């Protein structure tokens, strides 16, 4: 439905911003 | 449909963010 | 109602969100 | 009512994050 | 109640991130 | 109840997300 | 039920940012 699917692609999208703010932070870490 | 489109539009726009933050950490990953 | 009007206005920023965000990445792409 | 207020100040401060994220794309642009 | 009291938190952070969010965009201007 | 968890975690991130990028905004202000 | 699994997953990706967001703004100051 309309409002669980927006949610689910919603999580996805999260996880996957996640993973790469994490790899940015890896890069600048010393 | 006020609630579905608004929850629509942000759950795309949700996963384009996604997409260019992992771009972003390509470019700066070793 | 000001929750439908919030919900319009929070799409319509993450779209313009996603749009500068695409433009950031495409600067950094090698 | 509490909900109604915290959403129309999430959607402000939205609107100013998408003006922000649009400056820097400009700065950024080739 | 927690859910009225975690949107007003969420309020207050979206607006300080709008702050911020036009100080990098002012000291990225020209 | 798991949702209002949610809620309450969501709106802490929210927090130390706000705090940091008012530091990254200190480190780049002239 | 997917909405609680969604909300679940969108906390832990939002605490996992916060963390990154704080490893970078500890990158950049003295």
Do not use: L, R, S, T
Request: aromatic fraction near 4%; proline fraction near 0%; charge should be positive.
């Amino acid at each position: 439905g309309e409002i669980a699917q927006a949610m689910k692609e919603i999580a996805k999208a999260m996880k996957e911003i996640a993973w790469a703010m994490k790899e940015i932070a890896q890069a600048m870490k010393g």
